Enzyme design. Structure first.
Site, PDB file in Angstrom:
ATOM      1  N   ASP A 145       0.830  -1.195   0.000  1.00  0.00           N
ATOM      2  CA  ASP A 145       0.000   0.000   0.000  1.00  0.00           C
ATOM      3  C   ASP A 145       0.869   1.251   0.000  1.00  0.00           C
ATOM      4  O   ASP A 145       1.908   1.305   0.665  1.00  0.00           O
ATOM      5  CB  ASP A 145      -0.929   0.006   1.214  1.00  0.00           C
ATOM      6  CG  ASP A 145      -2.210   0.776   0.963  1.00  0.00           C
ATOM      7  OD1 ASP A 145      -2.285   1.495  -0.055  1.00  0.00           O
ATOM      8  OD2 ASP A 145      -3.145   0.661   1.785  1.00  0.00           O
TER       9      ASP A 145
ATOM     10  N   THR B  85      -4.195   8.645  -2.855  1.00  0.00           N
ATOM     11  CA  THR B  85      -2.938   9.099  -2.272  1.00  0.00           C
ATOM     12  C   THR B  85      -1.801   9.129  -3.287  1.00  0.00           C
ATOM     13  O   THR B  85      -1.060  10.113  -3.359  1.00  0.00           O
ATOM     14  CB  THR B  85      -2.552   8.205  -1.086  1.00  0.00           C
ATOM     15  OG1 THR B  85      -3.696   7.999  -0.248  1.00  0.00           O
ATOM     16  CG2 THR B  85      -1.441   8.851  -0.272  1.00  0.00           C
ATOM     17  N   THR B  86      -1.649   8.064  -4.076  1.00  0.00           N
ATOM     18  CA  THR B  86      -0.586   8.019  -5.073  1.00  0.00           C
ATOM     19  C   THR B  86      -0.979   8.737  -6.359  1.00  0.00           C
ATOM     20  O   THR B  86      -0.108   9.273  -7.055  1.00  0.00           O
ATOM     21  CB  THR B  86      -0.210   6.568  -5.378  1.00  0.00           C
ATOM     22  OG1 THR B  86      -0.179   5.815  -4.160  1.00  0.00           O
ATOM     23  CG2 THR B  86       1.159   6.499  -6.040  1.00  0.00           C
TER      24      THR B  86
END
Ligand SMILES: Nc1ncnc2c1ncn2[C@@H]1O[C@H](COP(=O)(O)OP(=O)(O)O)[C@@H](O)[C@H]1O
Lengths: 318, 512, 517
Positions: B49, B82-83
């Site tokens: 993750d 998030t990424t």
């Protein structure tokens, strides 16, 4: 630190040469004779030394050079003695001298409001025939927001005042008495500079001290009531110890002001200008030691109110 | 000993951000690569993750620190994205880098970026279609389609999808939040006859048995869990203390003096009504016999998570005292059963007055099937929760970025100013999702991006990308969607981060 | 060589070099701001939080310089900050321009006395000609929009996005106390921070505002005298450990009963002396809250040094962190203390206004703690700008429309008196062209064309370059009808301080030695 003087610079410098340091020390050692003569001196000495070195390199002896220098000094002294002239001393000459001094020291801006005050102080101090002394003039300083702000007070200045203001300030003929008794130093229990274990002895000592303080304030109250009895004849007391507000209120109820936290120089100037005896008792004695005061004013500025006393006997304190 | 201000500072900031951008890139798709992280202690952990990797890494750079802080704030306020935001910011910086050294004031590109973001938000709002109780007759057909969409994500068995639907539809009573972090889940170990079981109550795993453990009743009519932090073990109590050793009567005397106080304390704590003692420390040998002689219940060795679940379900209160207790800070259950399956003694607490947590036992009789196949059910229940709670939805995949890029490119041809190239670069930088997806899937993105651009040149549908068949199909028919509210927030956060990065012109250090 | 010890590079040649280069390098790290632009700079010192600022005050307060020429300007900056509200970068820019223009005169071959005299003459002429460009003036201060326009104009210099709501809030908070006429204080407005929603949900409230919870009862009486204390709930009885497991229950029960009786006697003596409430600044306990609930005594929870400092500087009490129960010696003037529920939080409200010396506290709320600092800075700047101590502010069209007019007037005046005093006048006139150049260079276009356009239209003095793209190249706009004005006394004080600093710098310029140990 900004400076431009000659002696102040020569006294606070870090010279790496020992000969230059010795020359500066010799030059500063001869500055306590006249006013300011440490400047405009190294140039002539350097020129004379350069001329002597040139004459030595040309081919001569230092003895003839020293004899010629002594002869020239004698001739210059004779010429200065023969060329001198007298002039009647008045107000314009001193004004011009002070203006030239201020111009040579400070810039050509605020050099007009200081010369007048200096001349006024000189005229107020000098009035006899003996030479005056520069020990009765106190130069104080404050903290304000402006720059050009000067004042010439004809009386004394007291830094501290009272803790309970707003009562009265138009006291004409006032009587000042200087003492040093313990009126109210601190409410903490004490003995003789040594802690003990029993509390009865220290509480009895505290009760006796309180009774003595009550007796002293009753004595000074009856003294003020005897030597006065009205509101025109005021009384002012100077003490270096604290003052309790409960007693200060009862004192001010009859018309006598008591100041706390006084410096030694203040009471010294007060007893030197007026002329009072400093005793260690609050008994009913002769009122010959009580000094007279003409006008008292309270100036409120900053975090502490100042006191100005003037119109006293023999105004010799500017 | 050298420092500048302006272009070199921005170049250094971009170069520092590129490091943290390339550090996490392969972990984006569903089948990302694993990463092993080991600190200075000596223990290593394997994770895939992006949030776990970003949380276990610190950078001594101001721009990278601000970027990871914004990413953490976005992950904490939302929970997805998030990424992608970091990749979008990196692509924006890479596209704006060549348009800086040519003598351009960056104070004119912020307005263009803001206008482009506003236009994209308006287009997404005008193109989003929401559906919630307006068709498909009665509600009996919506749950079937929801279960079908949940099972279409991962090709699993038919009996596993029905149990997942039953366990996700039976926990929607008092839950009013937007995340499953309230009830949670717990994976158990072991095997059983069936493949999966469901129950409503508290679950207790293996318990150590002793001699005469069958003296306690198996079924309770009205059990009451004793919430006491103290335990009754051989180490807690004592039968012989500091006494003078002379004869044998002193031992009996001191043991009676201790047993008097022990009996007083136990009768005082039992008179309140509590009878199901859940001691944290394991039981001894004589404590079980003493509890069975009084027709009571005894236990030992229980984790803290089970105690918290019991306190949350049964409604227990935190007790910070041993003696002098009342009858109001105790818990009340209803049915307590002990069912042994295989080689373990499972305990069920059914009949809680507060229906909060439920046990979903998944045991097939193996050692590797328990750890594996655990992310599919999580993704399924997350998709179900997102489809139930959120109203607006749109076709997922790489079918929403190409349309926006084409719209921006078509709109940029109607402005006579310096913002034309800026909008063109902004539209070009938006293509980073499907290329990265194809690169992570092990395919050729050059053979798919051209087909996508040719199909989106005049169609404008929901044709995304595929993984299994490796082709281009309609994402609206593949039963894969995404909420229309997370993408807007992600784009806004990316734009704000880009503006904050481009606004910094220099730094100032202070020695002392 | 003879005076210094290989430490400083001072002598008879560094004057027309280092004394100007130091000021130039100090001012070069400041021209990037000055104007509504987004040039945030990060500040890293000792807090270790990485925060970006825009104003030069916090930038100069953190930078440490080791030069007298750079330290001679921070004093004037602090003096200008203490005098009026805004005004900081103007003095630095003026001093830098004056030094850069006097460097050429010193390199050509002129004495410093003539330059100083010319600068003084130019400053006197500018001060004499300044009271002549008065356009607008303040009418009535009892309205709302009349001061709201000025507040918006003052806030637009800092924040460019949101500036109407903050200006309206500041105007409503200032109009609810006392206007400029009569007497108006500055330290009577407090700003509180609430961690909740965004800035689009702020409000106003008169009186004291503090985020303090209450675990007792609502005491809405007037006899509830306050009693501030340091740490009353610290630890009057220190308990130790005898064994390892546990000790005898008898001694523990006796100690607990003794402590309970002691605290009961303490609270009874503190309540029977004339104090219903008590201000605590320590921890809490079960028996403590039990006694506070059974004795009808309000008990707080949140403690802060700023709160007790404000309570001490406002009321005038003194904390007594003693073990033995003392006497009541903290009698104040408060009496009306009410409780309110704002944002699901308990707040206190003090009512003690007698139509004189009223106080106010605006409620602020934001996302994080790194965003309310700029809001508080804008609020205090607007508050300081509202204070002018005059009924008629005599506002002038600021932004650079008056600087060009003043420069043209000085140039026209200097071409009359002969002598060697025209060069200094021309330099002082040309130094006034540093405000429009910095405003045009910090936008996106050049500054030569802007100056040519401003000098080619007319000498009206109401034209200035805008901020949008349609106002950069033409730069032909009328700021009189828009509402962009500046302070009259502020510019005068800034010019005076800049001239004084330039004179002080040009005067003290010779050899910098050292002091002996
Ligand atoms: N919205 C605006 N329109 C025109 N001029 C402005 C605007 N905002 C600020 N200015 C100008 O910027 C200059 C600097 O303002 P400010 O930063 O408040 O003072 P300082 O630079 O002394 O801190 C002011 O002289 C003002 O004329």
């Amino acid at each position: 630190k900004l400076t431009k003087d000659g002696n102040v610079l020569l006294h606070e410098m870090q010279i790496q040469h020992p000969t230059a340091s010795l020359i500066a020390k010799v030059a500063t050692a001869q500055d306590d004779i006249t006013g300011d003569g440490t400047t405009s001196n190294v140039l002539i000495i350097g020129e004379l030394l350069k001329q002597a070195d040139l004459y030595i390199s040309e081919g001569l002896h230092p003895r003839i050079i020293t004899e010629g220098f002594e002869a020239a000094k004698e001739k210059a002294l004779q010429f200065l003695e023969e060329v001198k002239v007298s002039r009647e001393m008045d107000r314009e000459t001193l004004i011009d001298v002070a203006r030239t001094s201020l111009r040579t020291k400070v810039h050509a801006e605020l050099a007009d409001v200081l010369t007048e005050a200096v001349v006024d102080s000189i005229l107020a101090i000098k009035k006899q025939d003996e030479p005056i002394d520069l020990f009765m003039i106190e130069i104080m300083e404050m903290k304000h927001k402006s720059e050009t702000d000067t004042s010439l007070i004809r009386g004394l200045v007291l830094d501290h005042g009272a803790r309970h203001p707003d009562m009265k300030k138009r006291v004409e003929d006032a009587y000042i008495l200087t003492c040093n008794v313990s009126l109210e130093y601190e409410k903490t229990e004490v003995n003789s500079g040594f802690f003990y274990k029993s509390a009865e002895e220290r509480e009895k000592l505290v009760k006796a001290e309180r009774k003595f303080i009550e007796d002293r304030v009753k004595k000074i109250i009856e003294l003020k009531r005897k030597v006065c009895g009205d509101s025109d004849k005021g009384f002012v007391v100077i003490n270096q110890k604290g003052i309790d507000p409960f007693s200060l209120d009862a004192l001010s109820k009859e018309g006598i002001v008591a100041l706390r936290r006084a410096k030694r120089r203040n009471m010294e100037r007060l007893t030197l200008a007026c002329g009072g005896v400093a005793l260690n008792s609050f008994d009913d004695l002769s009122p010959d030691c009580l000094g007279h005061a003409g006008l008292v004013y309270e100036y409120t500025l900053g975090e502490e109110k100042f006191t100005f006393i003037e119109k006293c006997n023999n105004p010799r304190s500017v | 000993t050298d420092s500048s201000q302006g272009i070199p500072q921005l170049v250094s900031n971009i170069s520092a951000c590129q490091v943290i951008a390339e550090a996490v890139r392969t972990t984006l798709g569903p089948r990302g690569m694993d990463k092993l992280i080991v600190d200075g202690r000596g223990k290593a952990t394997i994770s895939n993750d992006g949030a776990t990797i970003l949380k276990l890494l610190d950078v001594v750079h101001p721009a990278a620190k601000t970027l990871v802080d914004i990413a953490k704030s976005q992950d904490a306020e939302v929970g997805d994205g998030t990424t992608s935001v970091t990749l979008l910011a990196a692509e924006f910086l890479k596209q704006v880098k060549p348009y800086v050294e040519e003598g351009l004031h960056p104070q004119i590109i912020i307005r263009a970026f803001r206008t482009a973001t506003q236009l994209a938000v308006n287009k997404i709002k005008e193109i989003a279609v929401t559906v919630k109780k307006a068709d498909k007759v009665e509600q009996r057909k919506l749950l079937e389609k929801c279960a079908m969409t949940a099972l279409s994500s991962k090709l699993i068995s038919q009996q596993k999808a029905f149990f997942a639907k039953m366990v996700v539809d039976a926990v929607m009573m008092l839950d009013d939040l937007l995340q499953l972090k309230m009830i949670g889940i717990k994976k158990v170990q072991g095997g059983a006859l069936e493949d999966s079981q469901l129950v409503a109550g508290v679950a207790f795993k293996k318990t150590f048995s002793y001699a005469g453990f069958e003296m306690q009743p198996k079924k309770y009519h009205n059990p009451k869990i004793a919430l006491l932090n103290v335990e009754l073990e051989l180490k807690a109590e004592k039968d012989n203390a500091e006494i003078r050793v002379h004869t044998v009567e002193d031992y009996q005397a001191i043991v009676d003096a201790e047993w008097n106080i022990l009996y007083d304390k136990l009768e005082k704590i039992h008179h309140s009504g509590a009878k199901v003692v859940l001691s944290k420390l394991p039981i001894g040998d004589v404590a079980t016999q003493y509890f069975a002689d009084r027709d009571m219940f005894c236990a030992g060795r229980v984790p803290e998570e089970d105690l918290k679940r019991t306190m949350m379900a049964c409604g227990g209160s935190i007790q910070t005292s041993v003696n002098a207790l009342s009858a109001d800070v105790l818990g009340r259950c209803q049915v307590f059963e002990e069912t042994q399956i295989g080689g373990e003694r499972y305990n069920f607490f059914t009949g809680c007055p507060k229906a909060k947590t439920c046990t979903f036992i998944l045991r097939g009789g193996a050692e590797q099937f328990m750890e594996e196949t655990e992310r599919s059910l999580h993704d399924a229940i997350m998709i179900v929760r997102r489809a139930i709670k959120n109203d607006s939805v749109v076709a997922g995949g790489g079918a929403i970025e190409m349309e926006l890029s084409k719209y921006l490119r078509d709109y940029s041809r109607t402005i006579p100013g310096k913002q034309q190239l800026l909008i063109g670069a902004y539209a070009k930088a938006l293509e980073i999702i499907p290329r990265q997806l194809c690169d992570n899937a092990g395919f050729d993105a050059t053979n798919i991006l051209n087909k996508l651009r040719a199909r989106h040149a005049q169609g404008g549908t929901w044709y995304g990308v595929d993984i299994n068949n490796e082709d281009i199909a309609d994402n609206f028919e593949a039963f894969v969607w995404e909420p229309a509210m997370v993408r807007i927030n992600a784009l806004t956060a990316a734009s704000e981060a880009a503006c904050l990065i481009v606004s910094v012109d220099e730094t100032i250090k202070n020695p002392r | 060589m003879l005076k210094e010890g290989a430490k400083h590079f001072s002598g008879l040649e560094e004057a027309v070099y280092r004394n100007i280069q130091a000021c130039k390098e100090l001012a070069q790290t400041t021209r990037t701001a000055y104007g509504p632009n987004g040039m945030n700079k990060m500040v890293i010192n000792h807090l270790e939080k990485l925060f970006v600022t825009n104003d030069a005050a916090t930038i100069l307060r953190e930078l440490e310089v080791q030069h007298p020429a750079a330290k001679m300007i921070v004093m004037a900056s602090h003096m200008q900050e203490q005098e009026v509200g805004d005004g900081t970068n103007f003095v630095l820019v003026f001093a830098g321009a004056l030094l850069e223009l006097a460097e050429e005169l010193l390199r050509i071959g002129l004495s410093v006395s003539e330059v100083i005299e010319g600068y003084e003459i130019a400053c006197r002429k500018a001060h004499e000609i300044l009271p002549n460009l008065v356009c607008c003036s303040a009418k009535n201060l009892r309205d709302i929009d009349e001061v709201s326009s000025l507040l918006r104009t003052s806030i637009m210099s800092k924040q460019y996005g949101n500036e109407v709501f903050l200006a309206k809030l500041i105007a409503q908070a200032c109009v609810s106390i006392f206007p400029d006429s009569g007497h108006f204080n500055v330290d009577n407005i407090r700003v509180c921070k609430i961690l909740g929603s965004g800035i689009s949900s702020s409000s106003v409230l008169h009186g004291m505002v503090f985020k303090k919870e209450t675990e007792g009862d609502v005491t809405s009486v007037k006899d509830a005298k306050i009693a501030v204390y340091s740490c009353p709930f610290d630890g009057m009885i220190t308990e130790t450990k005898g064994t390892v497991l546990i000790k005898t229950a008898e001694e523990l029960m006796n100690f607990s009963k003794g402590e309970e009786n002691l605290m009961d006697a303490q609270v009874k003596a503190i309540a029977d002396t004339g104090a219903n409430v008590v201000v605590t600044g320590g921890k809490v306990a079960d028996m403590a809250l039990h006694y506070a609930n059974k004795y009808n005594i309000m008990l707080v929870r949140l403690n802060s040094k700023w709160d007790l400092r404000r309570l001490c500087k406002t009321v005038g009490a003194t904390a007594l962190p003693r073990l033995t129960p003392p006497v009541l010696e903290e009698m104040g003037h408060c009496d009306s203390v009410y409780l309110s529920e704002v944002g699901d939080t308990q707040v206190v409200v003090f009512k003690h206004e007698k139509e004189d010396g009223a106080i106010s506290t605006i409620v602020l709320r934001g996302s994080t703690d790194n965003l309310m600092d700029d809001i508080e800075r804008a609020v205090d700047d607007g508050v300081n700008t509202f204070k002018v101590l005059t009924r008629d502010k005599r506002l002038v069209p600021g932004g650079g429309a008056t600087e060009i007019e003043l420069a043209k007037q000085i140039t026209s005046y200097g071409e009359t008196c002969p002598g060697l005093e025209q060069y200094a006048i021309k330099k002082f006139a040309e130094a006034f062209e540093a405000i429009p150049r910095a405003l045009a260079e910090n936008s996106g276009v050049k500054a030569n064309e802007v100056i040519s356009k401003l000098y080619a239209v007319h000498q009206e003095g109401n034209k200035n370059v805008g901020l949008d793209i349609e106002a950069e190249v033409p730069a032909v706009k009328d700021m009189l009808e828009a509402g962009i004005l500046d302070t009259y006394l502020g510019k005068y004080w800034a010019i005076k301080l800049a001239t004084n600093a330039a004179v002080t710098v040009l005067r003290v310029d010779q050899i910098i030695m050292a002091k002996p140990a």
